[PDB]
Design a protein around this ligand. Structure first.
Ligand SMILES: Nc1ncnc2c1ncn2[C@@H]1O[C@H](COP(=O)(O)OP(=O)(O)O)[C@@H](O)[C@H]1O
Ligand code: ALF
Ligand SMILES: [Ca+2]
Ligand SMILES: [Ca+2]
Ligand SMILES: [Mg+2]
Ligand SMILES: [Mg+2]
Length: 994
């Protein structure tokens, strides 16, 4: 129905031929599903694989090797005919390592995207509809919604399709439509039609757009368009502007990447400058311009060898890996920095009802007034059986099933629960279980009314569906609901104005049925109902009431209590303004107490363990709830936040007590207290903000709309999968499984990702530095060249490839969740850790020039035995005072250079074994703890063995095979790099700080 906002409510109902209070017939739905199809979208598109590869070649560090591979290809056209084959290989060596990391990235990305979509599509989105099938509102899939049927939405709900508002069951309806219209602050909706058909979405103040959320209130409406025809569906199939952005940690690495890109660039020019005197050497035989190209090729090859290629890829791989690992644990990671932030998290704030608890409400206790003397007050307490939402239970007075209608106080109490109620009950035919429609606290009352068959309604012959709201519907037909004063958390109560249905209670007058937190409701009571009579509220009576609240609340069941009262003589209907909810409390004054219900809400089993695990990781868990302080503390003890006998007078505050404190004292209380109760949504964010003033990484956990500000304020917001759509929208991570332990796993994951980045850097730096100091050592001591540009590239492919990337798959340390979180002030590289780089780099650099000099001197079977003549090897051409009389071109042998190349590769493969942890020993953390690394080392090692023995290869790479004795020398020098870092690991762990 195009331009349904233009037509009135009456014209929209007749447009599809629907009854407003009834809904579509089962035959109408069939025709509309055939005519309009399902309310869904063709899954948009997805990340193209061709575009998934092009992202691997966008970073600076990768693009550097990009320009290098091109230059080496261009310079290959200036190569002489005799030495062609060697030149063509150079750019392929540079390009192959880029593809190697590109494959791992795209592969890991695909697996991450699949795990996410396999979790997003797991749980189907539902919507509340009114149809001729059932009397009460039923729950159906959003995909089966069609224009026509009447749809109900309340606070926190997500609008399924484009809805034309028929009636607003609240005094105000505010809608969060920032996802469409862009406007942040919630907007007010009305039922009046907008005459302009060409009006914008912002002018459609009677329409409810799909994908948006209801910030406040509750309305009833008819669907206008579904599927692609939706106003948000028009831009979904085209305007797909992604909200992709690099994480803070990713930006910290890219900053460090350019930091190295400058330093390496400097030391590469430093190579080309200290070798200007070799531009006119007989080794090249070229002019002063030809010899400059060779050492220029060295600088570029040394650059490629030094420049981290996997760094921009391993961070994307680890991030994607974390996302998949969270999707595995049924956790929707809405924002990429979610995992890494929970690693830094020091404080986790959390809502109580629905978050820390299962939100499976059931009334088990209730009491009314029995007898009131001058100072004596007795109560008629009752017990209710049944933990689920099924209308199956018994009211027990002294272990005896009693008739609810016998007690007049129970009649009024049940009346209140059914009338002062926006939620209902619906039976699921598929699962065979009664499901709530709306708030769990309210539905608990709905099931109570059904069990409290007050008017003795025949229900034994009703189906499971009809049994759901049978007794409730009865009461609704007794009093006409004029209007409702929605539940507000400042007043902490809800009211409903009712008039008689002109039948039985017609000769009485209007009434208001109030329901809310015991504190406020009782304070606003001036009388108490004794059956049908009324007596003034006094001291002893008020005290007796509250005493039972405290009992059930702080008891072993920790009951969520709720007071029920009525205003016998309400103000005139025309003397009440419904524009401001601030006046609603005054309308709920001069009340008369009727009774109190107490419902159990069992805490999730995985909570107590999680809090203890958080405590081991040095993470505080603060409960912030709007519930009673007595209940809040009692539950804190049950989940481990407080001791069973711990004094909590200094560690637990109400919103009132918290406000009485000076601002400076409020800030101090947040790092002290762990339990805040009777708190407004403003307090939750205020507490979070207070913790952030101490520069602590704060997380928020919740499910309701009252958590949204704190979820936005915190570093990372975690919503319950069974929570509201509002809470999820304001979150960075959604727990679909509602598993609290998944939060702890996300913490470990974040700490693991950060640690893997450290060992990745710890390896790639300490190794590449050794390559640099090796080149400078030869030029400093006077020894001949150790490596050629082609050999430099080969080391790069073999050492800075998969053995580096595999470190992103390292296991977490043995004490990763037994150590306090990393401070935001902590730098990327410690001063001690930088010494670690030079200590290893210095050895492996001198271990390479030492193996090359070993072949010249100490080598026995190795052809060529000299002493202290390596320093002066360019003299024998013109002078040979101490030379034995051997060949004058022995210093250009490929054998000693192959020794240096062999050690350089091997000693880095060993160095990668030291990159399984930071301070943990190689014995405590065995080398077989990472199979992915060992598989990369052997592949790199074997690929090096091919280059030496496969006939055409060592000629191209200018190498010669090593004897079995020569390899033993390689291992003799390479292997003790393990012991060096082992000592360094022993110092930091024991003599320093473990
Ligand atoms: N629908 C409702 N109608 C009336 N009172 C309510 C309703 N829901 C909750 N309350 C009362 O208001 C108090 C505050 O609720 P809220 O601030 O949402 O957090 P919590 O439900 O965790 O207490 C509750 O303790 C409850 O007694
Ligand atoms: F525990 Al709540 F809103 F559900 F404070
Ligand atoms: Ca490199
Ligand atoms: Ca290297
Ligand atoms: Mg709540
Ligand atoms: Mg909640």
């Amino acid at each position: 129905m195009e331009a349904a906002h233009s037509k009135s409510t009456e014209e929209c109902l007749a447009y599809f031929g629907v009854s407003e209070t009834t809904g579509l017939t089962p035959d109408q739905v069939k025709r509309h599903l055939e005519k309009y199809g399902h309310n869904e979208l063709p899954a948009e598109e997805g990340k193209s694989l061709w575009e998934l590869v092009i992202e691997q070649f966008e970073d600076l560090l990768v693009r550097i090797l990009l320009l290098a591979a091109c230059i080496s290809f261009v310079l290959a056209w200036f190569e002489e005919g005799e030495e062609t084959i060697t030149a063509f290989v150079e750019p392929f060596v540079i390009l192959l390592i880029l593809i190697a990391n590109a494959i791992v990235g795209v592969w890991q990305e695909r697996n991450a995207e699949n795990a996410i979509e396999a979790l997003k599509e797991y749980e189907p989105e539902m919507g509340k509809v009114y149809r001729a099938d059932r009397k009460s509102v039923q729950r159906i899939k959003a995909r089966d919604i069609v224009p026509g049927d009447i749809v109900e939405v309340a606070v926190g709900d997500k609008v399924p399709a484009d809805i034309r508002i028929l009636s607003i069951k609240s005094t105000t309806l505010r809608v969060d439509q920032s996802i469409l219209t862009g406007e942040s602050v919630s907007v007010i909706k009305h039922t009046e039609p907008v005459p302009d058909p060409r009006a914008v979405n912002q002018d459609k103040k009677n329409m409810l757009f799909s994908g948006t959320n209801i910030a406040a209130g509750k309305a009833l409406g008819i669907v206008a368009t579904t599927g692609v025809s939706t106003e948000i569906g028009k831009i979904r199939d085209q305007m797909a502007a992604t909200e992709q952005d690099k994480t803070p940690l990713q930006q910290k690495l890219d900053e460090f990447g350019e930091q190295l890109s400058k330093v390496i660039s400097l030391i590469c020019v430093a190579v080309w400058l200290i070798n200007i005197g070799h531009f006119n050497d007989p080794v090249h035989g070229g002019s002063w311009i030809r010899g400059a190209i060779y050492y220029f090729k060295i600088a570029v090859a040394l650059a490629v060898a030094a420049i981290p290629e996997g760094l921009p890829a391993v961070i994307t791989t680890c991030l994607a890996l974390g996302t998949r690992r969270m999707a595995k644990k049924n956790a929707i990671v809405r924002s990429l920095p979610s995992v890494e932030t929970l690693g830094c998290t020091s404080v986790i704030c959390s809502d109580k009802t629905g978050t820390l608890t299962t939100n499976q409400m059931s009334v088990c206790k209730m009491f009314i007034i029995d007898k009131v003397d001058g100072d004596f007050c007795s109560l008629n307490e009752f017990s209710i059986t049944g933990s689920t939402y099924a209308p199956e239970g018994e009211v027990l007075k002294n272990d005896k099933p009693i008739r609810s209608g016998q007690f007049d106080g129970l009649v009024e109490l049940a009346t209140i629960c059914a009338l002062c109620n926006d939620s209902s009950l619906d039976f699921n035919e598929t699962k065979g279980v009664y499901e709530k429609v709306g708030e769990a606290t309210e539905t608990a009352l709905t099931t109570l009314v059904e069990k409290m068959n007050v008017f003795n309604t025949e229900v034994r012959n009703l189906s499971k569906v009809e049994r759901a709201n049978a007794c409730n519907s009865v009461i609704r037909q007794l009093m006409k609901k004029e209007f409702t004063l929605e539940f507000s958390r400042d007043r902490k109560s809800m009211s409903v104005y009712c008039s008689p249905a002109k039948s039985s209670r017609a000769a009485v007058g209007n009434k208001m049925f109030v329901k809310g937190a015991p504190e406020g409701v009782i304070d606003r009571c001036n009388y108490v109902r004794v059956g049908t009579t009324r007596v003034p509220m006094t001291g002893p009576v008020k005290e007796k009431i509250l005493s039972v609240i405290k009992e059930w609340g702080t008891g072993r069941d920790t009951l969520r209590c709720l007071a029920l009262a009525t205003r016998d003589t309400p103000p005139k209907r025309e003397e009440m303004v419904l524009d401001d909810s601030s006046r609603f409390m005054e309308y709920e004054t001069d009340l008369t107490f009727v009774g109190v219900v107490g419902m159990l809400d069992p805490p999730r089993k995985e909570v107590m363990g999680s809090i203890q695990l958080c405590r081991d990781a040095g993470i505080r868990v603060i409960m912030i709830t709007g519930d009673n302080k007595g209940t809040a503390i009692a539950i804190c003890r049950r989940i481990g936040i407080f001791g069973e006998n711990e004094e909590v007078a200094d560690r637990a505050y109400t919103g009132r007590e918290f406000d009485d404190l000076p601002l400076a004292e409020q800030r101090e209380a947040c790092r002290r207290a762990c339990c805040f109760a009777r708190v407004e949504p403003s307090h939750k964010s205020k507490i979070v903000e207070y913790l952030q003033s101490y520069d602590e990484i704060t997380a928020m956990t919740g499910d309701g709309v009252n958590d949204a500000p704190a979820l936005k304020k915190a570093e990372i917001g975690i919503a319950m999968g069974s929570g509201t759509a509002v809470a999820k929208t304001a979150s960075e991570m959604v727990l679909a499984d509602d598993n609290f332990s998944t939060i702890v796993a996300a913490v470990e994951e974040g700490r693991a990702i950060y640690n893997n980045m450290k060992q990745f850097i710890r390896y790639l730096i300490s190794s590449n530095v050794g390559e640099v100091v090796c080149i400078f050592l030869t030029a400093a001591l006077g020894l001949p060249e150790a490596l050629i540009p082609v050999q430099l590239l080969w080391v790069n492919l073999v050492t800075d490839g998969l053995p580096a990337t595999a470190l992103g798959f390292n296991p977490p340390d043995l004490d990763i969740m037994d150590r306090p979180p990393r401070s935001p002030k902590e730098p990327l590289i410690s001063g001690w850790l930088f010494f670690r780089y030079m200590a290893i780099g210095g050895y492996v650099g001198a271990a390479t020039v030492g193996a090359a000099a070993w072949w010249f001197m100490y080598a026995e079977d190795g052809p060529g035995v000299t002493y202290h003549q390596l320093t002066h090897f360019m003299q024998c051409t013109e002078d040979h005072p101490h030379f034995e009389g051997l060949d004058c071109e022995i210093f250009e042998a490929p054998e000693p250079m192959t020794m240096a190349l062999s050690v350089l590769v091997t000693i880095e493969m060993c160095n990668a074994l030291n990159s399984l942890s930071e301070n943990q020993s190689l014995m405590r953390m065995p080398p077989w703890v990472n199979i992915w690394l060992l598989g990369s080392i052997c592949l790199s090692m074997s690929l090096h063995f091919l280059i030496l023995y496969v006939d055409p290869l060592p000629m191209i790479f200018k190498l010669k095979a090593l004897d079995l004795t020569q390899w033993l020398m390689v291992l003799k020098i390479s292997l003790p790099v393990i012991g060096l870092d082992e000592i360094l690991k022993f110092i930091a762990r024991n003599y320093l700080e473990g």
